[PDB]
């Protein structure tokens, strides 16, 4: 076993070299280090068979000792990239960067990132490091989205420069300038114009590309496959070129020249050998080619992911040239047409997946096969259609999955090479125009208002062609395409030229008039007529007709939603409804705009409701169930009515628990419209829970919940009402019973649940001290004094114990054990809209634990490990008295955000997605929370990576950070509490708070995050692993959590997964802004990200894979038809929250919002949440809507105008207060985000327990 033996080696030499240190002193130290480096060198270099364990043997034991890290940058890189063993050489690298030779060392760790895929932290580095210019970074800015054309133009206008003064370019950015521009003319299939620059470096004047590259082996590693690539690629479409074939000839002869070209590429050999007509040399390589696939593939790595993604993403290729000499050596394949036919029915099948592979991948694979179709119909002397039609639907096929990358100039070069082809039949050309034209509409989705008009005004032309002309008469599908294609694309236009006035009609000539012919308000009117009359003929004319009612549907809802400041009512209704009686998921998401619109108009459009949603699978609004549910106490209940029967018909455990929530609060009405919903919810209420075991499972639930800390939040009920004045009457009288039902006589729990372990130690001893409650506090009516109430809520803790030990303390579900058909339980958390459900195939409760684990926190949930009859353990979190509707609809926003994610090409090829759970409030003031297996909290794993010392220097000490800050307020305001800030504001400028916070962050250990991954990670190519994915992470949840603004990002709201370094995002308190707005001390900073996230990633900087996340999931969120802002405002605009519930929610925590109500019950305003977070998708600067909000809420206090000049910038050093307050773009967005969140004069004044320092 070679490796231990290399474990043996890499301890002994480290040990010989530790142990050396007593004798042997600095004068032979260095000899004998110089002599081991020396040494290290020259088996590095004289080595001729890289073995794996020897090589990363060496750069193994080097890297541990500083003095042997200036080893040899040009051989490390050599040595792991042929010993395909990068995650070393990369660990060597940082190392010796950490700590010109510092240049070179950065051109061999690109070196070493650029072949494990990883282009995120390959553009990190070409900014910060080799940069001193400022057309590198606009062409590197221009090259990280799909756009190399204006990307490699700024490269070639760069190297060919004459004087430029303002100083030299180096020669480390002299020839990246070349590579990057190979790179660009790749990505795109210009063939013609890779190898000329490929070749431009060797030689002049038609240079010899036959031994010069042979010598001075730089010229072998870059120009040679770009060179070899680029002339075979040409090849393979007819030419003569006689270039390749001569030099491959003179180069197989010999060991130096035909073993590199026999052991690397072999199949660019079996494609030359198969154009020079031998098949056994091609058949001879390909069989080395797959032998070579083989053993590099059992070479890399299991856990590094897209290095073995992009190593198979080969092999159909590979085995396409396979087949098609297994297709060509048959004779029986030659004179008759059904292998032929039969190839081509499984060619047209197996195509590589949009969205998912790059387009080199397509482009291998289609050139080879029309590479192999030409061949074919060689040798074959209809038949000559039937290839063609093969040929000509790959290439559309190619096409259609090249827009849904973002590549339109490599998408408009096919379309144009394929226009003329596509001329002879109407089919072909009605699919060529509309593949043009959604080409169109999809790239004008970021191009401002002015370009939008002229990128659509040439779209309209080409339609006035011919298949207009009888061809839109025979076939009906084409027929429907361009009607929906035409009012969308008079929907952009009517939509750019209205948030710019009348300015883009003005930069025309010509083109306003051609606007005109289809002043300044009297146009827009005639444009969306003319985008409603073509998206109506559409629907008069499984996703070929639900798209035709749903943008209708959706045009008509933005053109209510305009309104506001028509008989649209009906055809909205009808054409969602119809929609969603097929199987969709846009119509499905869109219901509650329904459920607004019959309520805002309904004095028509109603009857028409109940008649179309008369005939629904029910099973479509399971997700909706709490929404139809809350309506029972509400007027105009008779819109939905049967599909509750239907529901409460069939599947009579997905509505049990949204029917407690609504029984809870029903003031019914008393008209004859009025008189028969009483009947209807006594009816469900008699029909539902039959066996009567529900009303005792959350009986039985609702005792395991502690109820000392429910004593606080009755005492809070009553304090809030009672003691104001004395004209509220039975309020407290109706709410006793509450109390009443929990504690007083010992036979009402017994009654309710089961005769509880607690209540002999509760409601017995508190008998001598309650019954002076239950004969004068029921009728006491003082509204005086409370502390009678403080002084034995303060002796009931001491005497308590949280421990119960066991399951006993709820005794109906110790001894379960179902018996019979008596209504079987089947535990919550299913039924989440999916289709149509199983519910004899979902998991019934079979048992339960007995132990109970209570969690660290002030609430005290309980997790509780059951049993499922699938002989599994489910563990749950049981979470008593607090309302859990709330996170369980931010859930759902994060779920369809984290689908709206998987639908982008960027985001899902580095498979971008949040971490989810399960939330259901079973009734109000109850509820259960999934549980997530092994995981630590963010502050719990960077408290336990310290020592045992500095934990307690740290935590206690007057210099700690803690301690620190309070005394720093102290000294800059005069007073010891909350309200110290608001003087601060006022009381400092910004040097003094800057030079502090350096101060006070500079105390913490700054390797606090890396030596928590290096400690469990035990391998150099696990480390990369653990690191990427929490950078990949936190930089998701870091945007998503700012476009639904949450603040209150702690330390404690992160969870990471300990087996594969992961946060999760929990605790959804603030879910639009109010952080900022109602507490006192407001959060000024986007998001969370501090010195540990910053100091995680040296020597690289913030502008590379953080930078990279967050830009394309940006970009992922604002480019949508509105189905974020759309569930948004259904989640504001439900009636559970009317301040009520947050002044409740922000009771039951004791922090720093305390007694305030004056203005804020009449500022709420839930259009002001939606105005606001519209207005930052729309692009828009982040310390604008701070302004807006602090405006919106802090005014008439004395610090307003520093809470503006500190979240507002400083013009010399902050970017954000040098740019414009709206029409932003995506990377300067996300520029003035990190310019934000990363500030001293912000972090230096904020909340005391955000911790902003580590």
């Known amino acids: 076993d070679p490796?231990?033996?290399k474990q043996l080696f890499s301890s002994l030499f480290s040990g010989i070299l530790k142990e050396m240190d007593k004798f042997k002193t600095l004068s032979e130290k260095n000899n004998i280090t110089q002599k081991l480096l020396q040494d290290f060198n020259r088996f590095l270099n004289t080595t001729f068979s890289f073995f794996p364990p020897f090589v990363?043997?060496?750069?193994?034991?080097?890297?541990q000792h500083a003095a042997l890290l200036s080893l040899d940058p040009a051989a490390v890189s050599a040595g792991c990239l042929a010993?395909?063993?990068?995650?070393?050489?990369?660990?060597?690298l940082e190392e010796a960067l950490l700590r010109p030779p510092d240049v070179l060392r950065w051109v061999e760790l690109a070196k070493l990132y650029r072949s494990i895929g990883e282009y995120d932290v390959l553009r990190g580095i070409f900014t910060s490091e080799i940069g001193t210019k400022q057309i590198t970074q606009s062409a590197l800015l221009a090259e990280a989205r799909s756009d190399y054309s204006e990307a490699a133009k700024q490269y070639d206008e760069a190297l060919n420069k004459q004087d430029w003064v303002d100083g030299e370019p180096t020669e480390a950015e002299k020839d990246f300038w070349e590579l990057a521009s190979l790179d660009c003319y790749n990505h795109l299939a210009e063939w013609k114009s890779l190898e000329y620059c490929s070749t431009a470096s060797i030689d002049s004047e038609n240079p010899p590309d036959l031994n010069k590259i042979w010598s001075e082996p730089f010229y072998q590693e870059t120009y040679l496959p770009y060179m070899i690539r680029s002339k075979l690629k040409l090849l393979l479409q007819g030419e003569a070129d006689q270039s390749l074939l001569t030099f491959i000839d003179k180069a197989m002869h010999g060991e130096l020249q035909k073993a590199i070209l026999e052991l690397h590429y072999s199949q660019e050999l079996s494609l030359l050998y198969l154009l020079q007509d031998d098949v056994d040399r091609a058949k001879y390589y390909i069989q080395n080619g797959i032998q070579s696939f083989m053993q590099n593939y059992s070479s890399?790595?299991?856990?590094?992911?897209?290095?073995?993604?992009?190593k198979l993403q080969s092999v159909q290729a590979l085995t396409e040239i396979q087949e098609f000499i297994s297709f060509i050596s048959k004779q029986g394949n030659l004179s008759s047409q059904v292998p032929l036919k039969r190839l081509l029915n499984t060619w047209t099948n197996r195509y590589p997946d949009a969205k998912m592979d790059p387009m080199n991948i397509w482009d291998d694979i289609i050139t080879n096969r029309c590479f192999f179709l030409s061949k074919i119909e060689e040798k074959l002397t209809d038949i000559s259609s039937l290839i063609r039609s093969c040929k000509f639907s790959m290439k559309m096929k190619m096409i259609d999955s090249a827009r849904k990358q973002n590549n339109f100039s490599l998408a408009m070069k096919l379309l144009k090479e394929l226009h003329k082809e596509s001329k002879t039949r109407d089919d072909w050309l009605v699919s060529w125009v509309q593949s043009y034209c959604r080409l169109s509409h999809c790239r004008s989705r970021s191009q401002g208002c002015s370009e939008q008009v002229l990128t659509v005004l040439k779209t309209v032309s080409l339609l006035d062609e011919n298949n207009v002309s009888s061809y839109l008469s025979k076939n009906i599908l084409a027929f429907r395409d361009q009607n929906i294609l035409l009012g969308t694309t008079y929907r952009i236009i009517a939509n750019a030229l209205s948030s710019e006035p009348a300015c883009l009609a003005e930069i025309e000539e010509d083109k306003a008039r051609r606007i005109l012919e289809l002043d300044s308000e009297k146009v827009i009117a005639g444009l969306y007529q003319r985008a409603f009359q073509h998206l109506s003929e559409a629907v008069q004319a499984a996703a070929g007709v639900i798209d035709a009612y749903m943008t209708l549907a959706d045009f008509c809802d933005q053109q209510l939603r305009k309104e506001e400041e028509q008989a649209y009512p009906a055809l909205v209704v009808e054409k969602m409804l119809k929609a969603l009686k097929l199987n969709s998921n846009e119509a499905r998401l869109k219901f509650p705009r329904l459920l607004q619109i019959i309520e805002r108009y309904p004095e028509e459009t109603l009857s028409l409701m109940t008649k179309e949603i008369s005939s629904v699978p029910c099973w479509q609004f399971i997700?909706?169930?709490?929404?139809?549910?809350?309506?029972?106490?509400?007027?105009?209940?008779?819109?939905?009515?049967?599909?509750?029967?239907?529901?409460?018909d069939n599947y009579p455990q997905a509505i049990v628990y949204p029917f407690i929530i609504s029984s809870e609060s029903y003031s019914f009405k008393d008209t004859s419209t009025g008189h028969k919903n009483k009947e209807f919810v006594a009816r469900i209420k008699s029909k539902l829970d039959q066996g009567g075991v529900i009303q005792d499972f959350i009986n039985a639930l609702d005792q395991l919940s502690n109820p000392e800390l429910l004593f606080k939040d009755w005492s809070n009920d009553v304090r809030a009402e009672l003691a104001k004045t004395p004209v509220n009457k039975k309020n407290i009288e109706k709410m006793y019973e509450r109390m009443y039902a929990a504690l007083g006589d010992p036979k009402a729990p017994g009654l309710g649940a089961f005769r509880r372990k607690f209540i002999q130690t509760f409601g017995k001893e508190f008998d001598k001290h309650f019954g002076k409650g239950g004969s004068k506090l029921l009728r006491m009516k003082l509204s005086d004094f409370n502390d009678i109430t403080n002084m034995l809520l303060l002796k009931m803790n001491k005497d308590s114990k949280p421990p119960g030990n066991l399951k006993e303390c709820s005794p109906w579900m110790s001894d379960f054990k179902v018996e019979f058909l008596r209504n079987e339980l089947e535990i919550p958390g299913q039924y989440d809209g999916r289709g149509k459900p199983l519910p004899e195939y979902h998991v019934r409760i079979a048992g339960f634990d007995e132990r109970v684990t209570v969690m660290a926190s002030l609430r005290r949930p309980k997790?509780?490990?059951?049993?499922?009859?699938?002989?599994?353990e489910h563990p749950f979190l049981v979470k008593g008295g607090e309302d859990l509707r709330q996170d369980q609809r931010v859930e759902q926003l994060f779920q369809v955000m984290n689908g709206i994610l998987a639908q982008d090409s960027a985001c899902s090829q580095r498979a971008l997605q949040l971490r989810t759970y399960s939330v259901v409030p079973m009734t109000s003031r109850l509820g259960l929370i999934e549980w997530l297996e092994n995981t630590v909290t963010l502050k719990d794993l960077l408290l336990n990576t310290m020592s045992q010392e500095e934990k307690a220097a740290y935590l206690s000490d007057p210099r700690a950070p803690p301690c620190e800050y309070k005394d720093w307020l102290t000294k800059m305001s005069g007073k010891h509490d909350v309200g110290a800030y608001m003087l601060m504001y006022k009381g400092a400028n910004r040097t003094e708070t800057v030079t502090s916070f350096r101060k006070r962050e500079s105390k913490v250990p700054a390797d606090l995050l890396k030596r928590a991954f290096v400690r469990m990670s035990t391998s150099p190519e696990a480390f990369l692993a653990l690191r990427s994915h929490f950078a990949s992470s936190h930089a998701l949840i870091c945007i998503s959590h700012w476009i639904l603004g949450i603040g209150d990002r702690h330390l404690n709201n992160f969870m990471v997964a300990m087996e594969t370094g992961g946060v999760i995002g929990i605790d959804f308190g603030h879910a639009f802004g109010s952080a900022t707005q109602?507490?006192?001390v407001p959060e000024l900073m986007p998001f969370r990200l501090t010195r540990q996230f910053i100091n995680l990633m040296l020597p690289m900087k913030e502008t590379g894979l953080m930078y990279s996340i967050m830009v394309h999931a940006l970009r992922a969120f604002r480019s949508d038809p509105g189905l974020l802002t759309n569930t948004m405002d259904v989640f504001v605009k439900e009636p559970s929250f009317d301040w009520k519930n947050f002044e409740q929610k922000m009771l039951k925590k004791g922090g720093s919002w305390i007694q305030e109500i004056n203005v804020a019950e009449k500022n709420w305003y839930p259009r002001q949440k939606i105005c606001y977070a519209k207005r930052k998708l729309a692009g828009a600067n982040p310390a604008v809507i701070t302004c807006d909000e602090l405006l919106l809420g802090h005014e008439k206090a004395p610090a307003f105008r520093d809470y503006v000049a500190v979240a507002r910038g400083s013009k010399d050093h902050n970017i954000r207060a040098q740019e414009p307050e709206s029409g932003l773009s995506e990377e300067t967005q996300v520029k003035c985000l990190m310019d934000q969140a990363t500030d001293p004069n912000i972090l230096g004044r904020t909340w005391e327990g955000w911790e902003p320092w580590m």
């Open 3 to 5: 490796i231990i033996a």
């Open 56 to 63: 990363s043997c060496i750069q193994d034991i080097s890297c």
């Open 83 to 92: 010993s395909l063993q990068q995650p070393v050489g990369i660990r060597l």
């Open 300 to 310: 890399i790595d299991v856990l590094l992911h897209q290095s073995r993604l992009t």
């Open 623 to 648: 997700s909706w169930i709490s929404h139809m549910v809350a309506l029972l106490d509400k007027d105009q209940a008779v819109a939905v009515q049967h599909s509750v029967e239907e529901i409460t």
């Open 863 to 872: 997790r509780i490990i059951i049993r499922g009859h699938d002989e599994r």
């Open 1078 to 1080: 109602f507490l006192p």
